[PDB]
């Protein structure tokens, strides 16, 4: 709404300035405005959108984890009663986090995904959908936790199916999707074996296709392959 009077190109320009200034909330608001113009996003623009919201929600998740840890300690035997404040403030942060996730999911549903026909765009958006449901799942404790988890799984699975058919095994989007879906398995779905298998198979199939790549594509793919290895090392 607030960005309705600003030109699309000016919103994109400002998102880039906001990134340089490390003003990620501003960057996300600019990119939301740009999406709401209704035109499809280019590759560069999709990456601006993802960076902005990743940084905003990343900060909320880190804060939530600090507060949840304090709250869990408060519920241990021998802890002194300090009143409702820790729970209240964790809830406040949580609600704000959920709001950001709902905003992103809303942009994807209205109407980024449905207009995305090329494999690279569609997989990118479906990965995002999986990621923001995963963030919702991290904080979910009630009747809908299972459905939230399944929503993440379904989005990731659709993305995986497209990526395997349409993209090479070194494609950075396909690699990043696999990295994150593997973490979903380990941290959310209580499926560490699936997580490890996915990471390993993804790494090995990428390794086998590196020979096809330019120097610059090699750099991009090997970076994410190293993240897969890092997780495998953490988990084995």
């Amino acid at each position: 709404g607030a960005m309705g009077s600003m030109e699309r190109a000016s919103l994109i320009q400002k998102a880039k300035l906001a990134e340089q200034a490390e003003r990620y909330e501003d960057m996300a608001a600019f990119m939301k405005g740009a999406v709401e113009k209704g035109e499809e996003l280019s590759c560069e623009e999709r990456n601006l959108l993802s960076v902005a919201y990743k940084n905003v929600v990343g900060g909320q998740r880190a804060a939530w984890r600090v507060l949840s840890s304090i709250e869990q300690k408060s519920n241990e035997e021998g802890s002194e009663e300090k009143g409702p404040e820790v729970r209240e403030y964790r809830e406040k942060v949580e609600t704000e986090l959920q709001g950001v996730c709902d905003t992103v999911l809303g942009l994807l549903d209205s109407h980024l995904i449905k207009e995305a026909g090329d494999a690279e765009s569609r997989v990118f958006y479906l990965k995002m959908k999986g990621d923001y449901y995963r963030y919702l799942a991290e904080v979910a404790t009630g009747d809908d936790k299972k459905r939230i988890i399944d929503s993440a799984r379904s989005a990731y699975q659709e993305a995986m199916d497209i990526s395997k058919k349409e993209m090479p095994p070194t494609n950075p989007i396909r690699l990043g999707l696999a990295l994150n879906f593997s973490v979903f398995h380990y941290e959310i779905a209580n499926s560490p074996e699936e997580a490890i298998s996915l990471a390993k198979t993804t790494f090995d199939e990428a390794m086998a296709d590196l020979h096809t790549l330019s120097e610059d594509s090699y750099k991009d793919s090997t970076l994410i392959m190293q993240l897969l290895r890092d997780n495998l090392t953490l988990w084995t």
């Binding site: 990621d131 990043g176 990295l179 994150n180 973490v183 941290e187 994410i224 993240l227 890092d230 997780n231």
Partner: peptide, 5 residues
């Protein structure tokens, strides 16, 4: 915490 992108 594990790596995601």
């Amino acid at each position: 915490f594990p790596a995601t992108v």
